[PDB]
Amino acid sequence: RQIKIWFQNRRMKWKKRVFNDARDIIQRMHLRQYELL
């Protein structure tokens, strides 16, 4: 279920942001935008 290996490949371009998200939980499960839906 790793469809974010391409659809989520762009932040590694400027390599100066991922480190931000990665600084949460798992640069994913840390979110929850799936809630409310």
Side-chain angles (χ1 to χ4, degrees), residues 10-22:
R10 50 279 318 291
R11 211 134 260 162
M12 266 179 82
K13 286 281 103 117
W14 34 104
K15 300 196 181 172
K16 243 266 130 106
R17 299 288 215 277
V18 38
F19 313 123
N20 210 356
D21 309 64

Side-chain angles (χ1 to χ4, degrees), residues 3-36:
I3 345 89
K4 285 201 112 88
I5 310 275
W6 314 128
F7 267 102
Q8 232 201 319
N9 256 235
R10 50 279 318 291
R11 211 134 260 162
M12 266 179 82
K13 286 281 103 117
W14 34 104
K15 300 196 181 172
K16 243 266 130 106
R17 299 288 215 277
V18 38
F19 313 123
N20 210 356
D21 309 64
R23 204 121 214 170
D24 266 313
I25 315 291
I26 287 92
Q27 169 145 341
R28 153 142 181 170
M29 46 206 310
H30 75 250
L31 248 184
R32 189 113 111 203
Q33 79 269 258
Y34 83 75
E35 235 215 22
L36 95 103

